[PDB]
Design a protein around this ligand. Structure first.
Ligand SMILES: [Mg+2]
Length: 126
């Protein structure tokens, strides 16, 4: 049973806690790191790349679109499927996510299993 490697970057620690637990329990998903802001995920993104990055747009110090733009310029996005997560679903923002190479965009709140199903779409095979 092959595991899709997932990383999470979000500044709501209770969501990161819950979501890491839920995704790990899935047979085809392995959560390999979590970060609470944009700087920390970039530190981690050096050296260690997931198949899927769950990425909150609104974050202290360094936000989701900044991370996405840095990762697109470092050729990370060829491997990494980035799924933007946010309650700020403004139409120009999405457009930026698209230009900066996001695979997907999801609104908070979301059903966990519906997010699982999108992880399997962007990174699952057979
Ligand atoms: Mg946020």
């Amino acid at each position: 049973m092959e595991k899709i490697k997932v990383a999470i970057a979000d500044d709501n620690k209770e969501l990161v806690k819950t979501l890491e637990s839920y995704l790990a329990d899935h047979p085809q998903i392995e959560v390999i790191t979590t970060a609470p802001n944009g700087k920390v995920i970039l530190s981690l993104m050096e050296n260690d790349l997931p198949d899927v990055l769950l990425l909150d747009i609104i974050m202290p110090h360094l936000d989701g679109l900044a991370v996405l733009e840095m990762m697109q310029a470092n050729e990370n996005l060829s491997k990494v499927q980035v799924i933007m997560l946010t309650a700020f679903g403004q139409e120009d923002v999405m457009k930026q996510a698209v230009d900066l190479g996001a695979s997907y965009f999801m609104l908070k709140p979301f059903e966990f299993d519906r997010l699982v199903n999108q992880i399997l779409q962007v990174a699952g095979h057979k």
